[PDB]
Symmetry: C3
Subunit: 333 residues, 3 copies
């Protein structure tokens, strides 16, 4: 009887940060309450000032990471304010039935709905909007995020021993298909409805114009680089709702990787690069051993360095000359 | 001595259905006899009436699923009637030697041949036509299917416990490259030979014009949706002879997945989406828990919903409100 | 104290061959010394005579395979002669810190440097050039290779039993983006610097013009086919620094495959085809059972047979009619 269960309200945070949670469950099963408000908004996605009409959960691309434990119930209040123009819904890949919830959560502007589902399988999972006839358009306008369903006893390695992370970040990777004219310049529009046939044509090329982390070129750089210290254990959750990616930590590794995101499987060890298929969330665990700047990229390096799928970590601490050293610094022959 | 073995004749069925077989072998090793007749034919592949010259095994795209057990012998009588125009052959990825059989099965119109091979490795495997100099053209005209080599003791989970399916379906996914003129309209042709240089150019774009299940947009919908009941265990075999795909059951999961199709490996558990590389067959096992319509898609959602790689399941039975429920149906604020 | 360790000098060989090494380590940890000289050079990459300005480690595309054991130190002397025009560096995916070494190995023409790192994780790994602001351009001009870090006790199967290879080959797969004019003809250039904005535009299409093994169409054919004998155990290391590939041995299998290349994981068994993500090296072990010609391909068959990603094995020995035979050779009905 669900009404006998504790309820807990979560207040979400903006990616790449993740709301507070406990790895090992400190309570029995609960109903975990979340609220998200849909926001259609203009977003500038590159250095050149290219502007799109983004479709967001809670104002960000990606939407926020939700965290529960296996056999909790997720109860989502989804709000579509009357300042929006389009119908939206939500499909959770974590959920069972009704198109992931999509068939039950169609909200017009000015409506809201509350969906409950049981989180029966542990892992990281994509969620995304999916309105009938308009699915890729909403997804590729930014309307996707992820949910993490932790095992009740937290994460385990390939030998069943505990893995505990000190920090967690969520990297949402977004492929955009900004329409171009014949000469190759992007079109700008007053409303989201002003793209539709042009959006379909752009999408049908299967060639993104931009591929970004956290909604824009350079979003995870500068004052907004990810941070860690030497010795810290970091979990990086990465999602791609529509298109394959291949993450890589330049200067590091994925010590334990669940490339397709599902924690009942043993992790793959010592990965250089891993493939997260489109429509999937994955997770990588790494312990930093060297200080300095790292680049976290999609290792199609054109996608990384020309299209935008690159971020930075800035790591503090002690350099280890045993692991790497410059024996003879660059100099003339 | 092969002549001392039983012979059994199989009569194939059209995809997505699968001919009758036993999961656990009820006999010793056998010579399993199959006959396929090659048919070049016009196929309408979309709602707009786009017509191609398809190259088929047994009249369908994909070709039919063949089912044997490990250490059976497969004996295929391959017929190329004189009503066809092209030379064809067959390469079985299940087989060892002679380019999968391709070097031994070149048949001109008006010829036939009989190939035998031993099915030494368990799994699902692609088969496809592969004539020297014309390989991608034949494959991407539809001339591919799959073969399942079951372990003699049937399928097993990650703990070595039995997995028994109640129903099986075969989803062949086909990338087509229909040539376009400068303005973007498809060209139509009187004969298969009328494409060749234009076909090569279309293929070299690496951008399919259509990606379909069972040979056409919408083929696995309506009266031709896949069916199941709540509680039934379903195996879905999926193949892609040329290009990566990432299947996903919208509203469900792959409870046990062999993404690259080979049954001596433990399955991956609880998959949302999985990557089947081009040139591979994979298999997913799911037990339905909720009734209703499900969409089975390639989760590049542009490929699914714009290019055609989407089908439906229609599931009968009892809705489970514990797993999912609408707490507050969509309504005005 | 590293100065107390033995030093051993390796003399590299041209791909697809691999320098001499021992699978099971016959010594304790060592400092393994390598020297590579960067060469910018014109390369003809296809049958039509298309010429690019390649950027190479040691004169070849790919760069040579380096082989060490886990917990050895790699000490690389990297030389950029004054006959080159560009700055270069090196990032080892095997290494920890400083962008894989890239931050420590920037060499102008006329400079050299010596980097040391500890090979702490076993596997095959990509290495590539990565100069700030010019990363994909250098990589997709050929400036990448791989390093194998063997476990000290050699390779093991999924049951922890030894796997010993008789022969090893290294297949580097390269995506090139040769700029085209409006009509579709390739542009030719006097210097590497003559591409830059045109190179970026070509890359941004995400559509390679050529995908080759060992630096050219047909490089691993004819007198340069790979060779083996029936009964021989062969390890094929395959790398792709920028773009996914899906290798397949036509007529064979990957008996044991580490698709993402990391030897602390059990291999996948009986693969038909496997996905090596861009930015990764993988390895496949096969025992030949049939003589004849095999084709080793990327199983996007357009990429193989139209764009160049195909090579051959020529295998000597005894045909096994139990595994495959032509029962009735092609003939008229
Ligand atoms: Cu939406
Ligand atoms: Cu989805
Ligand atoms: Cu054919
Ligand atoms: Cu094949
Ligand atoms: Cu370089
Ligand atoms: Cu790299």
């Amino acid at each position: 009887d669900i009404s006998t269960l504790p309820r807990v309200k979560v207040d979400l945070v903006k990616p790449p940060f993740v709301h507070a949670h406990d790895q090992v469950a400190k309570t029995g099963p609960r109903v975990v309450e979340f609220t998200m408000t849909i926001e259609e908004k203009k977003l500038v996605i590159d250095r050149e000032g290219t502007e799109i009409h983004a479709m967001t959960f809670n104002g960000s691309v990606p939407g926020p990471l939700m965290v529960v434990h296996e056999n909790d119930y997720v109860e989502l209040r989804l709000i579509n304010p009357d300042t929006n123009t389009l119908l939206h819904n939500i499909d959770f890949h974590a959920a069972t039935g009704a198109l992931g919830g999509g068939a039950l959560t169609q909200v017009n502007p000015g409506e809201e709905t509350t969906l409950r589902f049981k989180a029966t399988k542990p892992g990281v999972f994509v969620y995304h909007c999916a309105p009938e006839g308009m699915v890729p358009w909403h997804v590729t306008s930014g309307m996707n995020g992820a949910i993490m369903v932790l095992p009740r006893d937290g994460l385990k390695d390939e030998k069943g021993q505990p893995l505990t992370y000190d920090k967690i970040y969520y990297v949402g990777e977004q492929d955009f298909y900004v329409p171009k004219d014949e000469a190759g310049n992007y079109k700008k529009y007053e409303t989201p409805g002003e793209a539709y046939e042009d959006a379909v044509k752009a999408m049908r090329t299967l060639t993104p114009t931009h591929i970004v982390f956290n909604g824009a070129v350079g979003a995870l750089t500068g004052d907004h680089a990810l941070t860690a210290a030497v010795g810290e254990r970091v979990l990086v959750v990465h999602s791609q709702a529509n298109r394959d990616t291949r993450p890589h930590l330049i200067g590091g590794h994925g010590d334990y990787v669940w490339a397709t995101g599902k924690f009942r499987n043993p992790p793959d060890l010592d990965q250089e690069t891993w493939l997260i298929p489109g429509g999937t969330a994955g997770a990588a665990f790494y312990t930093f051993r060297q200080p300095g700047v790292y680049a976290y990229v999609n290792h199609n390096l054109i996608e990384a360095f020309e299209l935008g799928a690159a971020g930075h970590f800035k790591v503090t601490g002690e350099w280890n000359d045993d692991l790497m050293t410059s024996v003879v610094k660059p100099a003339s022959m």
